[PDB]
Amino acid sequence: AIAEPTSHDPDSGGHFGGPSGWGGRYVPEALMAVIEEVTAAYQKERVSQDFLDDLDRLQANYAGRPSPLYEATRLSQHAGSARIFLKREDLNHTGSHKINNVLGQALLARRMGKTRVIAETGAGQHGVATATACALLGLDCVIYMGGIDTARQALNVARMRLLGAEVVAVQTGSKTLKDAINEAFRDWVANADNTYYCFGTAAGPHPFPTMVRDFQRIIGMEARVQIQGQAGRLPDAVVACVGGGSNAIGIFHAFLDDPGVRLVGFEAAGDGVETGRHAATFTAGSPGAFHGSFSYLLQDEDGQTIESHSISAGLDYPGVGPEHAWLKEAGRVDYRPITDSEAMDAFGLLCRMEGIIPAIESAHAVAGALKLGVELGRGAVIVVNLSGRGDKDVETAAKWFGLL
Amino acid sequence: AIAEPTSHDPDSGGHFGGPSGWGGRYVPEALMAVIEEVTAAYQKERVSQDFLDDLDRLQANYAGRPSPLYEATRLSQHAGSARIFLKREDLNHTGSHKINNVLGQALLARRMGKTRVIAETGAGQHGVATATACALLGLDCVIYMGGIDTARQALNVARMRLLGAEVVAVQTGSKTLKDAINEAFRDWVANADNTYYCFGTAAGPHPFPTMVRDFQRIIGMEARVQIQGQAGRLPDAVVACVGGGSNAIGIFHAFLDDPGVRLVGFEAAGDGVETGRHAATFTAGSPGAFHGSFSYLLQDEDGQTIESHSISAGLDYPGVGPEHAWLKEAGRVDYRPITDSEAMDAFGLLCRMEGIIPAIESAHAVAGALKLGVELGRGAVIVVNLSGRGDKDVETAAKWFGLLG
Amino acid sequence: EASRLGPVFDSCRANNRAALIGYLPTGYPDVPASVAAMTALVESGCDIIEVGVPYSDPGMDGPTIARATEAALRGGVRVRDTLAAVEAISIAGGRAVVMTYWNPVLRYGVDAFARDLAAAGGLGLITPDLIPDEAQQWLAASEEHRLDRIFLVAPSSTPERLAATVEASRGFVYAASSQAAPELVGRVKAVSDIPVGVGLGVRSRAQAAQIAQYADGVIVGSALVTALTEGLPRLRALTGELAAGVRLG
Amino acid sequence: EASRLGPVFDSCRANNRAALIGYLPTGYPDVPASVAAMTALVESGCDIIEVGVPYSDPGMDGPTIARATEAALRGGVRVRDTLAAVEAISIAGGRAVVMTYWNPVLRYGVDAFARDLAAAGGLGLITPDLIPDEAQQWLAASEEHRLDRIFLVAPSSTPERLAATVEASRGFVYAASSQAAPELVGRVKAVSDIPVGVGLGVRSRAQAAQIAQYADGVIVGSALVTALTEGLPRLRALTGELAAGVRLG
Numbered sequence A: 001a002i003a004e005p006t007s008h009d010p011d012s013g014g015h016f017g018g019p020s021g022w023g024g025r026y027v028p029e030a031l032m033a034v035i036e037e038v039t040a041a042y043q044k045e046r047v048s049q050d051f052l053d054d055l056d057r058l059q060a061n062y063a064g065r066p067s068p069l070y071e072a073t074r075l076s077q078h079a080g081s082a083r084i085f086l087k088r089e090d091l092n093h094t095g096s097h098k099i100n101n102v103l104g105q106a107l108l109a110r111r112m113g114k115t116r117v118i119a120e121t122g123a124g125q126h127g128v129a130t131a132t133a134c135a136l137l138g139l140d141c142v143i144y145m146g147g148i149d150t151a152r153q154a155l156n157v158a159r160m161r162l163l164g165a166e167v168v169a170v171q172t173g174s175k176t177l178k179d180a181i182n183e184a185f186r187d188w189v190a191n192a193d194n195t196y197y198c199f200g201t202a203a204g205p206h207p208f209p210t211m212v213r214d215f216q217r218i219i220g221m222e223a224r225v226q227i228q229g230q231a232g233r234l235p236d237a238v239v240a241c242v243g244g245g246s247n248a249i250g251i252f253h254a255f256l257d258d259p260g261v262r263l264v265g266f267e268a269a270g271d272g273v274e275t276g277r278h279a280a281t282f283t284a285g286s287p288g289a290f291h292g293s294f295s296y297l298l299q300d301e302d303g304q305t306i307e308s309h310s311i312s313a314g315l316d317y318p319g320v321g322p323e324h325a326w327l328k329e330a331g332r333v334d335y336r337p338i339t340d341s342e343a344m345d346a347f348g349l350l351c352r353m354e355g356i357i358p359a360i361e362s363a364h365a366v367a368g369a370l371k372l373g374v375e376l377g378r379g380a381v382i383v384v385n386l387s388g389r390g391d392k393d394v395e396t397a398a399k400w401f402g403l404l
Numbered sequence B: 001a002i003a004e005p006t007s008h009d010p011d012s013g014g015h016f017g018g019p020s021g022w023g024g025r026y027v028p029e030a031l032m033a034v035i036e037e038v039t040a041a042y043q044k045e046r047v048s049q050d051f052l053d054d055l056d057r058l059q060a061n062y063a064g065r066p067s068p069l070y071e072a073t074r075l076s077q078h079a080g081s082a083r084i085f086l087k088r089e090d091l092n093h094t095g096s097h098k099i100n101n102v103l104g105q106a107l108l109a110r111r112m113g114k115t116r117v118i119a120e121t122g123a124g125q126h127g128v129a130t131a132t133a134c135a136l137l138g139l140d141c142v143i144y145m146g147g148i149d150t151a152r153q154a155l156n157v158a159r160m161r162l163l164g165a166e167v168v169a170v171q172t173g174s175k176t177l178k179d180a181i182n183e184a185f186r187d188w189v190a191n192a193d194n195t196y197y198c199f200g201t202a203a204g205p206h207p208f209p210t211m212v213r214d215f216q217r218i219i220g221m222e223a224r225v226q227i228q229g230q231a232g233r234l235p236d237a238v239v240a241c242v243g244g245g246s247n248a249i250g251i252f253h254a255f256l257d258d259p260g261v262r263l264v265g266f267e268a269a270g271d272g273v274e275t276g277r278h279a280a281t282f283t284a285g286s287p288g289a290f291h292g293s294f295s296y297l298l299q300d301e302d303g304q305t306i307e308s309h310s311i312s313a314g315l316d317y318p319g320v321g322p323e324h325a326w327l328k329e330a331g332r333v334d335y336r337p338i339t340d341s342e343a344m345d346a347f348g349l350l351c352r353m354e355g356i357i358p359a360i361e362s363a364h365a366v367a368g369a370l371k372l373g374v375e376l377g378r379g380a381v382i383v384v385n386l387s388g389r390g391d392k393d394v395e396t397a398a399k400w401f402g403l404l405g
Numbered sequence C, D: 001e002a003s004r005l006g007p008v009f010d011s012c013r014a015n016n017r018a019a020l021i022g023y024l025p026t027g028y029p030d031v032p033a034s035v036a037a038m039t040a041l042v043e044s045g046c047d048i049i050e051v052g053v054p055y056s057d058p059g060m061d062g063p064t065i066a067r068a069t070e071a072a073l074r075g076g077v078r079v080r081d082t083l084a085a086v087e088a089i090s091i092a093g094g095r096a097v098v099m100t101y102w103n104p105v106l107r108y109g110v111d112a113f114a115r116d117l118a119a120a121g122g123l124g125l126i127t128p129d130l131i132p133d134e135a136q137q138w139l140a141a142s143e144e145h146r147l148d149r150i151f152l153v154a155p156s157s158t159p160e161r162l163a164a165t166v167e168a169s170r171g172f173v174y175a176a177s178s179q180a181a182p183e184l185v186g187r188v189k190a191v192s193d194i195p196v197g198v199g200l201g202v203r204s205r206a207q208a209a210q211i212a213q214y215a216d217g218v219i220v221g222s223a224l225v226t227a228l229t230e231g232l233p234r235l236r237a238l239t240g241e242l243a244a245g246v247r248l249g
């Protein structure tokens, strides 16, 4: 459904909310030629039937869409007897929602005649998906990953290399997601004429926030149809974890114009929001320009980026996408913190109750859904985006629970 | 409707092709009470629409069925310009076809009032699947796994433990699949009153060959519809890898009565069938009684079991299911060996051409399809059962391809 | 006609005692040593010797016998050594039956193995993983070569299977199995007069005498291996104590 | 009327030379040492001083400046130190602009920072990650407080964006970047007469001389940091050499 725009789209400059100024392009002039080139190519191909046919063919026969919606009845007793429905993005090829965005952008990269694709990765799921599509389409691929993330997500490093993608370990700064983005940015600036930057979350300069969301909208469109078919009505709440915001905006968007549907994003609170070791951008951050957009970020009084901390590599990011900043300002979505301990408890609970090993990212959403079920009460319908599976996190989780 | 007891089912004693043919029940009398109770329970529930509805409901919303069928166009030149179609069981929940059989059997165990489920595992996919269903259904779970397999499939060991299952490392014999089966067997004979045995392949005593195959039939049923939609005709061949035989029989069955469709199963040849370090049960084995059935196995001149070897933990098994023996004797299915090197070559080719990291088991089927494509030629349509994904084999593959040291 | 083992149980019943049935695996700790031990069992009062065929995957055996058969197979024991052990036991004046899993018999050939076992003086075959449902070939060779056929019954056996298993057995029925053993013997007595042997992890004279109160035969195996592992004199002493237990006066 | 840096480039044209534009980051190796270094730049012949604001994630900076600003931040440098450095330069008789990424300005407040930069004696602002498309608040602040606004053009800049960028600049245009540096200057000279500064990793007197043959200003930064790291006397000598290089025109 990418051919038709939305009433929630930004202006030509990538600004959400008019005077608020969320989004935009806070980039060097050296990137503007390729940034305009990607923007124009996306506007051309999003209405091209050949493009849409290729994307749909890959989502069905290659990625495994639609992903199912599963009512986790064994969680209900632990969620105030609410009814928790899991949108099973963990079952996509490569094991997360990232493949949705990557298939779109990889096909676009080939349409533009780019010979080289680069990407950042934190949890390694965007890196694997990108490597996956570059193997499939025959494109050179280089993935940038913080050195700390290469250690705690080592399964995905080896998957990427088996898929024939180069992996560059990033040792600057906090050696995590934001530092991988910094290094890949520098690569794009130097090699813009032949290199496509396949960005993995709903942030960055225009057109990335909108384009990523458009490729992820398929999640919420399926979920909106599936919840009505299974439950007979729209949900009381749709929730998701929020790193940069791609899986959350993907499942939220189809429900934006449903006034009775609560939308709740759950962000990583690490050791606790009062400890200075968290990634809770909305809870503790403030507006600013960062990584190409105007949005929220964790920053000190001079505007220096504060390094984030989370047990989850995929949420360990001090920024957040501008459309979420707009949705928070409008009061359409609420954003709440979930700590390391809360996430890991929900992790174990989902293992023992439902036989689903989730990504630690997605466990933050499950943890918040459990709390929201207690708030909403018996019979409330809550759709949860289960963004990824937890094979990459099995070592961390076994160590956490003493299973070594 | 429901796939009624068609003409391929064994007799009431579990025999394929005659009352003293393949299959049967070569078990101690100490298990016959629980074997007859499982056989009666399965015969009752396989014709119950409410049971099939429960299984179908879990397959659709929990396991992600149907799995797609993907034409791997970038393999064609390595397959004599044939067209390779991948049946993507790797996309099932837990990452393999094993979840199809486990959901059927765990629903059955719950229908019987059993509270404790035991299972063997080699690659750890059947163990993870069993542990997954036991968590989902509130059953106690104990998985037996050979000590050598717990080392080369360590990812699945931790998955099983996170799912609340006890994992028992088996140190007897070759410390692989056949030895884990022996230990799970000993557990069953001691706890036959309250424990259900969730067997993970199309072997063992009746009713396991038939019941496992029936729960995996959905693979070939979907694929037969999907391939006619995509290629416009029935395939020239359907291929799969063969350990005990569950994923192969699962995709073969819908095609048994299509006489123009070749069926080829590919078994693990390890270092080579002439080296004595292989698992090529049909290539080098002979008929005998093993693990509760009469079928082919690797055995010496006295009937002692010859230990098998494969880089693939899931194919590292010296036996094979009795229905495959019957189809081989009948000439309906051909069985051919694939070495470690051929399988790892196909593993790496699927990685860099299609972006799919397969199970090393499944890599044997891809490798055989490439060879088969050369034999059949340009335009041949070959359906391949991609039985699982290769996350469990990433460390093994990384060493093989020099990504470590 | 009469079973090959019929006279033995008749003679034991006439002396107010149970038959002592002793098991040893061929080739443990090696072929000559195991033959010497089986001969020692004959000399020490065993009425029937169970000659065990070591098997690669013996799922029904406890760790004591499993380790011993593993050692025998490492030593190169062959199925034909079990036949030679039967000869030596026949020559020593003993009475031998073979206990084996079914696949070595299939590999040997059922009729061929039955022929050679009877020729070596064997009196019967105990088949722990062959149920009567699959025993068509064995039933024919058992009648042709006049060998007893000892099937197993279990505490879990349904009434139908227990009756069919007893009807199929000749010589005695193996009641493999804390009061489940005497009531399992009682269920066999309720449908047939065939002798019943009991295996129950017998380790002492006292345990053998407990079984002799209700059973026609006391089966001992694991304890004989353990005794042999210590030494041949320890085996003779233990077998002497066990032959005392099966006697009631 | 005229740009704040207008007279500075006028005095350089009359002397048949390019302006020497030197960059140093505030707070490296510490705040007092950096101000002493920036004063030395004025004394050693720098026409314009670029005072850099250290930023936590300086994606456009090379390793020399990025590591120095990182060290400055480890030492606790603050944005107010930059304004104190501009005031010291103005008192010493120098002409200072501030080079900064945009978020520190957003955090400070664009108007408040423009006002405080003007009051410190600063003459302009260089904005490497602010394009005119987002510069609405800065344009208003630039005019209100009579500050030059130096945007960057790139070799890859489209003709339309180069024109819009040049039109939006006051003081000079920073031609950030073979033959691409003179070509980029020529593309600017074709649409306007505004001075053009050129940064090109200048390290030697000869390189400054080459660029002075077509550019209105020569921008040296990384080499000045490298010299300060060796020591303040090394910075004085290198700045002198570069000062002579821009007179070669």
Ligand SMILES: CNS(=O)(=O)c1ccc2c(c1)CCN2C(=O)c1ccccc1F
Residues within 6 Å of the ligand: B026, B027, B028, B181, B182, B185, B188, B197, B199, B203, B204, B205, B208, B290, B291, B292, B293, C055, C057, C058, C059, C060, C101, C102, C128, C129
């Ligand atoms: C050597 N003879 S044995 O030890 O008595 C003997 C007989 C039978 C079987 C075993 C040992 C191990 C496996 N087995 C089975 O029947 C079986 C297979 C798959 C699933 C469930 C099963 F129950």
Ligand SMILES: CNS(=O)(=O)c1ccc2c(c1)CCN2C(=O)c1ccccc1F
Residues within 6 Å of the ligand: A026, A027, A028, A181, A182, A185, A188, A197, A199, A203, A204, A205, A208, A290, A291, A292, A293, D055, D057, D058, D059, D060, D061, D101, D102, D128, D129
């Ligand atoms: C401190 N100012 S900076 O160094 O010039 C600067 C400006 C912009 C950006 C970066 C640094 C890194 C990230 N970034 C982006 O625009 C971006 C984000 C996601 C995807 C693609 C992108 F291109």
Ligand SMILES: C=C(NCc1c(COP(=O)(O)O)cnc(C)c1O)C(=O)O
Residues within 6 Å of the ligand: A096, A097, A098, A120, A121, A122, A123, A124, A125, A126, A127, A177, A200, A201, A202, A241, A242, A243, A244, A245, A246, A247, A248, A313, A314, A315, A359, A361, A362, A387, A388, A389
């Ligand atoms: C960081 C990337 N992953 C983030 C992630 C997230 C958070 O990213 P979003 O863009 O907010 O959806 C959620 N769930 C899973 C399974 C994830 O892997 C990555 O793989 O590079």
Ligand SMILES: C=C(NCc1c(COP(=O)(O)O)cnc(C)c1O)C(=O)O
Residues within 6 Å of the ligand: B096, B097, B098, B120, B121, B122, B123, B124, B125, B126, B127, B177, B200, B201, B202, B241, B242, B243, B244, B245, B246, B247, B248, B313, B314, B315, B359, B361, B362, B387, B388, B389
């Ligand atoms: C042995 C088990 N796996 C066998 C296996 C096989 C071979 O087993 P079959 O029963 O022949 O399908 C094929 N593909 C995958 C992914 C497998 O995991 C196991 O996981 O316990």
Ligand SMILES: [K+]
Residues within 6 Å of the ligand: A131, A134, A135, A138, A139, A140, A141, A163, A164, A165
């Ligand atoms: K690639």
Ligand SMILES: [K+]
Residues within 6 Å of the ligand: A071, A230, A231
């Ligand atoms: K329902």
Ligand SMILES: [K+]
Residues within 6 Å of the ligand: A288, A289, A290, A291, A292, A293, A294, A295, A296, A297, A319, A320
């Ligand atoms: K931002």
Ligand SMILES: [K+]
Residues within 6 Å of the ligand: B242, B243, B244, B267, B268, B279, B280, B281, B315, B317, B318, B319, B320
């Ligand atoms: K095999």
Ligand SMILES: [K+]
Residues within 6 Å of the ligand: D052, D060, D061, D065, D099, D128
């Ligand atoms: K700079």
